[PDB]
């Protein structure tokens, strides 16, 4: 398009990338040997381009390959210039010390067999350590520098005496792991890490805007959730980027023999290389620093508290020292530096989404291929609980599993392992379905515990109400086009009037199972405590898991110990109670309307739930039951069966029409009847069985396996003889005359 | 105005007991946020038909009819205690104030009559995704 916005392609001469400066191009700055014609690049980053080319037959463009880019470690966006480096001078003295990489290997003297390779033809620019590939050897000659005073690295001459320092230097060793600062582990908060770079570099690059504009650098955020799951991987990717450290955040360094000065002396540190160059703070949880005195006070945390808000108030203000906040948990943060003054401005914490789940999956898989038929998109939807670096933790899970059985099936390699097996040590798209599967939420796992997973098929019946359940599960969530047509948001419901003991925690447990979600069920025990306030943390608590695993439905039980209003049991324990159950009201009234925010109840029958908040306006939305039914009771009868051993002789169509008035306990009772007659009968015929064998050793072997390996229709007879009925004629109507009062 | 947006059963059918402590709790929120409206709306809901006249329910239910009759018959009389309730009946809510007899004027604020359900659905319409023919 224009002679400066070059194009990408490969070169038609030996080497990749065409570096050939065009009329203007070579004109305007020419590149030669003796004037080293240094390319604008990052962080004073000096490169010399030598590549064959023929201007003479033709005129070729400028091209900028991905090759010359990752030999310089230039990164985009930057323009390159090249233009003469009157910066580079010639060192004092040059220390040359021994790569420990390219001495451990060398034949003979290291020294004769390095300078060998390096006195000529070394391909190589004058930086002290440039990644520069030699071609031949397999060895890259990386010229390790003790000490360079001129510029980056001195001129290679022989009029320096190289000395051997007394130790060595990890550096090169560590640039490797530590260059690792990825973007994709960021997916998601794109915008917030654009603000921070914008506010920490150009701000600091560019302060004149900033006098200009009148505003200084704001104090900053962190991410809540784990370091790493957003804050330790955020930290490490900005000071990857960073001008002058920052200060870890750790508590114990006042706290010691001294006096605490070691505050003092943090701050002083912290000035002295604001004042060097642009520093940050390494801000920890917000939790770490303090509480705002609201626990204790503490002479010493008291003192460190005052000194802390005097740094940060009575901040260099000319230095424009940009300390880094944090975003911990509100609660933990401290309100002087929530207020204006102490900590310039404090943002939120970012959350992770769909899209930052693809990211971080792309990051997993270019750390090794682990698959080559897994739907990344197709997890990363399902993945919607995952948030952090759960997802990199269930990939590893998936490798090891995989692993595993690649390995067990293949060797127990107890000395070593298939050089073939290693290279074919691939992870599945099913292995990686089957770690999901087994794999969870992070918090679920610190949440809740498992529970016996049913088939919404395996239970029949109220298959209109399994639809609507279904469909407000998807449509309103793996829909979000439905959303936006209807623009409706998902309805709370309120509490299904189930049957009374069949239980709809058999519902909620087969629809939970199918749904694969989000789930919250909790039992009425969960927040009355001998520790004052304890079920209003618990409540807020539940709020705050939900909303950071949302969509999830609440199927509270102890509905009708909560439902009933603050009077009739007087006094209660003085209203406490009460004052739980309507603040967590209020929280879930009165909960965040996003994201999905659901909730499942249900009862025996409505009545013993009285309706103080179960009104459409502190319950939202409602949704009831009915009882059961016959045909439906066939239908689950049949259900039960099939997943038992069956038998034809027995008059299921009879048993469904004695059936009509019973419930599906009373059938899954009779079912276990019959199956203990059966169990007894072969018990029996088993005690007869050896009883003759002992009796007369020839009737041992003589004998059938199953004597009754189907239902008997007898036994099945005489179980529902002895069976009765549970359905009480009083009980349904107050069933429903609680539905009457609708 | 900061109407004081009265609930239903929150004040006849007191939680404290008779209909005299949510009045008299209603009675202190006026006086301190005056003028509070107290739109105690729906009546027929406020009053939730408690009943139950066996044993000391009997005389909780009565003390909380006689306290209700007592609000309406004196309260706070200021803040301008304004309550919209529902008449399902002549008698479903108080029908001694539904008679001229604990209300000397009545005064209900009459609306105009609108169709004003299908010009509440058509928004509705418009915030979702129904057009074309629409009877």
Same mark, same amino acid.
């Given at each position: 398009?224009?002679?400066?916005?070059?194009?990408?392609?490969?070169?038609?001469?030996?080497?990749?990338?065409?570096?050939?400066?065009?009329?203007?191009?070579?004109?305007?700055?020419?590149?030669?040997?003796?004037?080293?014609?240094?390319?604008?690049?990052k962080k004073?980053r000096?490169?010399?381009?030598?590549?064959?080319?023929?201007?003479?037959?033709?005129?070729?463009?400028?091209?900028?390959?991905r090759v010359?880019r990752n030999n310089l470690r230039v990164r985009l966006g930057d323009?390159?210039?090249?233009?003469?480096?009157?910066?580079?001078?010639?060192?004092?003295?040059?220390?040359?010390?021994?790569?420990?990489?390219?001495?451990?290997?060398?034949?003979?003297?290291?020294?004769?067999?390095?300078?060998?390779?390096?006195?000529?033809?070394?391909?190589?620019?004058?930086?002290?350590?440039?990644i520069?590939?030699?071609?031949?050897?397999?060895?890259?000659?990386?010229?390790?520098?003790?000490?360079?005073?001129?510029?980056?690295?001195?001129?290679?001459?022989?009029?320096?005496?190289?000395?051997?320092?007394?130790?060595?230097?990890?550096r090169?060793d560590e640039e490797e792991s530590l260059n690792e600062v990825g973007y994709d582990d960021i997916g998601g908060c794109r915008k917030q890490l654009a603000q921070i770079k914008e506010?920490v570099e150009?701000?600091?690059?560019?302060?004149?805007?900033?006098?200009?504009?009148?505003?200084?650098?704001?104090?900053?955020i962190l991410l809540y959730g784990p370091p790493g799951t957003g804050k330790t991987l955020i930290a490490r990717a900005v000071a990857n980027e960073t001008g002058?450290f920052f200060?870890?955040?750790?508590?114990?360094?006042?706290?010691?023999?001294?006096?605490?000065?070691?505050?003092?002396?943090?701050?002083?540190?912290?000035?002295?290389?604001?004042?060097?160059?642009?520093?940050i703070?390494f801000?920890?949880?917000?939790?770490?620093?303090?509480?705002?005195?609201?626990?204790?006070?503490?002479?010493?945390?008291? *003192?460190?508290?005052?000194?802390?808000?005097?740094?940060?108030?009575?901040?260099?203000?000319?230095?424009?020292?940009?300390?880094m906040?944090?975003?911990?948990?509100?609660?933990?943060?401290?309100?002087?530096?929530?207020?204006?003054?102490?900590?310039?401005?404090?943002?939120?914490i970012g959350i992770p989404d769909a899209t930052g789940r693809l990211e971080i999956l792309q990051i997993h898989t270019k750390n090794m291929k682990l698959a080559?038929?897994v739907?990344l998109e197709?997890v990363a939807?399902?993945t919607?609980?995952h948030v952090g670096a759960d997802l990199a933790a269930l990939c590893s899970?998936a490798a090891?599993?995989?692993?595993?059985?690649?390995?067990?099936?293949?060797?127990?390699?107890?000395?070593?392992?298939?050089?073939?097996?290693?290279?074919?040590?691939?992870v599945?798209?099913?292995?990686?379905?089957?770690?999901?599967?087994?794999?969870?939420?992070?918090?679920?796992?610190?949440?809740?515990?498992?529970?016996?997973?049913?088939?919404?098929?395996?239970?029949?019946?109220?298959?209109?109400?399994?639809?609507?359940?279904?469909?407000?599960?998807?449509?309103?969530?793996?829909?979000?086009?439905?959303?936006?047509?209807?623009?409706?948001?998902?309805?709370?419901?309120?509490?299904?009037?189930?049957?009374?003991?069949?239980?709809?925690?058999?519902?909620?447990?087969?629809?939970?199972?199918?749904?694969?979600?989000?789930?919250?069920?909790?039992?009425?025990?969960?927040?009355?405590?001998?520790?004052?306030?304890?079920?209003?943390?618990?409540?807020?608590?539940?709020?705050?898991?939900?909303?950071?695993?949302?969509?999830?439905?609440?199927?509270?039980?102890?509905?009708?110990?909560?439902?009933?209003?603050?009077?009739?049991?007087?006094?209660?324990?003085?209203?406490?109670?009460?004052?739980?159950?309507?603040?967590?009201?209020?929280?879930?009234?009165?909960?965040?309307?996003?994201?999905?925010?659901?909730?499942?109840?249900?009862?025996?029958?409505?009545?013993?739930?009285?309706?103080?908040?179960?009104?459409?306006?502190?319950?939202?939305?409602?949704?009831?039951?009915?009882?059961?039914?016959?045909?439906?009771?066939?239908?689950?009868?049949?259900?039960?069966?099939?997943?038992?051993?069956?038998?034809?002789?027995?008059?299921?169509?009879?048993?469904?029409?004695?059936?009509?008035?019973?419930?599906?306990?009373?059938?899954?009772?009779?079912?276990?009847?019959?199956?203990?007659?059966?169990?007894?009968?072969?018990?029996?015929?088993?005690?007869?069985?050896? *009883?003759?064998?002992?009796?007369?050793?020839?009737?041992?072997?003589?004998?059938?396996?199953?004597?009754?390996?189907?239902?008997?229709?007898?036994?099945?007879?005489?179980?529902?003889?002895?069976?009765?009925?549970?359905?009480?004629?009083?009980?349904? *109507?107050?069933?429903?005359?609680?539905?009457?009062?609708?």
């Amino acid at each position: 398009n224009r002679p400066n916005r070059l194009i990408v392609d490969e070169a038609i001469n030996e080497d990749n990338s065409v570096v050939s400066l065009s009329q203007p191009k070579m004109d305007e700055l020419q590149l030669f040997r003796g004037d080293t014609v240094l390319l604008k690049g990052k962080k004073r980053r000096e490169a010399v381009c030598i590549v064959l080319s023929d201007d003479t037959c033709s005129d070729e463009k400028i091209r900028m390959n991905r090759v010359v880019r990752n030999n310089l470690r230039v990164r985009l966006g930057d323009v390159i210039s090249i233009q003469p480096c009157p910066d580079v001078k010639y060192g004092k003295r040059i220390h040359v010390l021994p790569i420990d990489d390219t001495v451990e290997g060398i034949t003979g003297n290291l020294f004769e067999v390095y300078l060998k390779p390096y006195f000529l033809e070394a391909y190589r620019p004058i930086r002290k350590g440039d990644i520069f590939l030699v071609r031949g050897g397999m060895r890259a000659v990386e010229f390790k520098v003790v000490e360079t005073d001129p510029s980056p690295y001195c001129i290679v001459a022989p009029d320096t005496v190289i000395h051997c320092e007394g130790e060595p230097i990890k550096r090169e060793d560590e640039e490797e792991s530590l260059n690792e600062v990825g973007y994709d582990d960021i997916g998601g908060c794109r915008k917030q890490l654009a603000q921070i770079k914008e506010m920490v570099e150009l701000p600091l690059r560019h302060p004149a805007l900033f006098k200009a504009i009148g505003v200084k650098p704001p104090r900053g955020i962190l991410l809540y959730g784990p370091p790493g799951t957003g804050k330790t991987l955020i930290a490490r990717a900005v000071a990857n980027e960073t001008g002058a450290f920052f200060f870890l955040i750790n508590g114990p360094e006042i706290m010691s023999k001294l006096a605490g000065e070691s505050e003092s002396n943090l701050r002083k540190a912290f000035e002295e290389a604001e004042k060097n160059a642009p520093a940050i703070i390494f801000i920890d949880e917000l939790d770490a620093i303090a509480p705002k005195r609201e626990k204790t006070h503490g002479e010493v945390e008291r *003192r460190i508290v005052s000194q802390l808000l005097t740094l940060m108030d009575g901040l260099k203000q000319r230095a424009h020292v940009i300390v880094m906040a944090a975003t911990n948990r509100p609660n933990s943060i401290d309100p002087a530096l929530r207020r204006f003054g102490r900590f310039d401005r404090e943002v939120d914490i970012g959350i992770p989404d769909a899209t930052g789940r693809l990211e971080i999956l792309q990051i997993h898989t270019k750390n090794m291929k682990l698959a080559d038929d897994v739907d990344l998109e197709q997890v990363a939807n399902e993945t919607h609980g995952h948030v952090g670096a759960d997802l990199a933790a269930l990939c590893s899970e998936a490798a090891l599993q995989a692993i595993r059985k690649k390995m067990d099936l293949i060797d127990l390699e107890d000395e070593t392992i298939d050089a073939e097996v290693m290279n074919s040590l691939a992870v599945t798209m099913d292995d990686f379905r089957w770690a999901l599967s087994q794999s969870n939420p992070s918090a679920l796992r610190e949440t809740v515990v498992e529970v016996p997973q049913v088939t919404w098929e395996d239970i029949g019946g109220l298959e209109d109400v399994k639809r609507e359940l279904q469909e407000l599960v998807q449509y309103p969530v793996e829909h979000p086009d439905k959303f936006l047509k209807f623009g409706m948001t998902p309805s709370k419901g309120v509490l299904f009037y189930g049957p009374p003991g069949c239980g709809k925690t058999l519902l909620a447990k087969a629809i939970a199972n199918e749904c694969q979600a989000n789930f919250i069920s909790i039992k009425g025990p969960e927040l009355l405590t001998m520790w004052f306030g304890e079920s209003e943390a618990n409540v807020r608590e539940i709020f705050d898991k939900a909303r950071q695993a949302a969509p999830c439905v609440l199927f509270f039980d102890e509905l009708d110990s909560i439902a009933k209003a603050r009077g009739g049991n007087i006094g209660d324990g003085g209203g406490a109670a009460d004052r739980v159950i309507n603040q967590i009201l209020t929280e879930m009234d009165g909960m965040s309307t996003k994201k999905n925010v659901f909730i499942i109840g249900a009862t025996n029958r409505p009545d013993i739930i009285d309706p103080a908040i179960l009104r459409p306006g502190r319950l939202d939305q409602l949704i009831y039951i009915p009882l059961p039914d016959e045909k439906s009771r066939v239908a689950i009868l049949k259900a039960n069966l099939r997943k038992s051993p069956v038998a034809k002789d027995v008059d299921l169509e009879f048993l469904a029409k004695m059936t009509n008035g019973f419930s599906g306990a009373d059938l899954t009772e009779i079912c276990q009847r019959a199956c203990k007659l059966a169990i007894r009968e072969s018990i029996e015929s088993e005690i007869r069985r050896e *009883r003759e064998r002992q009796t007369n050793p020839s009737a041992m072997e003589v004998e059938e396996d199953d004597p009754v390996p189907e239902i008997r229709r007898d036994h099945f007879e005489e179980a529902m003889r002895f069976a009765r009925r549970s359905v009480s004629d009083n009980d349904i *109507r107050k069933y429903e005359m609680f539905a009457q009062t609708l």
